[PDB]
Ligand binder design. Sequence first.
Ligand SMILES: COc1cc(C(=O)N[C@@H]2CCc3ccc(-c4cn5c(n4)CCC5)cc32)ccc1C
Length: 305
Amino acid sequence: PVKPNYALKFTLAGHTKAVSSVKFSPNGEWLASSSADKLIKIWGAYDGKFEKTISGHKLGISDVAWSSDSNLLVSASDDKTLKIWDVSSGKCLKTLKGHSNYVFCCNFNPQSNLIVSGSFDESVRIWDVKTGKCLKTLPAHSDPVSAVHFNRDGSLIVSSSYDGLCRIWDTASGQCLKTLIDDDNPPVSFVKFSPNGKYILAATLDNTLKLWDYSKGKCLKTYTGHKNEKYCIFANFSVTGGKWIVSGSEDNLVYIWNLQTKEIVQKLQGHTDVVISTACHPTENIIASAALENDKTIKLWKSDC
Ligand SMILES: COc1cc(C(=O)N[C@@H]2CCc3ccc(-c4cn5c(n4)CCC5)cc32)ccc1C
């Protein structure tokens, strides 16, 4: 389609500090949000209706992520722990202790039997969901880890760091398979596998997004026009309608690019602070965006294509 037409439908207020990370449940019914106010909040994905608040962390939360069956959440906190939550009961099932600094990023594998985490302690850890035990500690980087993500079959982990590196790890052995970006500058602020696991979306703190061919280790696409020099902003593949790249920006907008042509197709105006997190609904043309302390709200946008 030439361009989407995302429009603001709901604004979700409730957090009392900067929002950090929003994620749609895989079954499409929920939006989960995490914030520096130490709280997780669950919202109706289609009407933004507040459902519950999930509490337990002693310090702010930087990231949250859903299990495959939409029943569990994992959260990553400045209190140096991750917590596994049962969403329906709101109870903490396990506290994952081991990191010696802020836990900044987390994700389930598709099987939902493992959790990967990255921390300011410059390590990546792989946890067993059932027992809460740390299975592997990877000396992954030499600076804070900005993102960790499994691929579609769970056999690979991509990690990024302020040391300027992006590395790909073999889940079963923890050994490095490849260093995709091997520079000491700029800091690599976010990474994510494409849905099919063949490409890696990478953000760097020079206002640049890139699409990398994992197998070839080569950059295929470069996306520019937004502002990103200070913070680790989430970025997404939007696949429900047109094939877009979606990202927040430090000029308080949501940017949407055509994946193939690299042209900006839309910019969503409304937030009053850095749009730190964006997320794309699994089935509908819906985007969730969240902003830092001057805003503290979540916005839901819907497009016809
Ligand atoms: C990594 O080291 C730093 C990062 C920041 C930074 O980005 N702070 C921003 C403000 C608050 C906040 C909350 C969450 C996230 C976040 C989590 N996650 C991503 N962003 C992407 C994936 C998981 C970021 C930020 C600041 C300093 C260092 C040393």
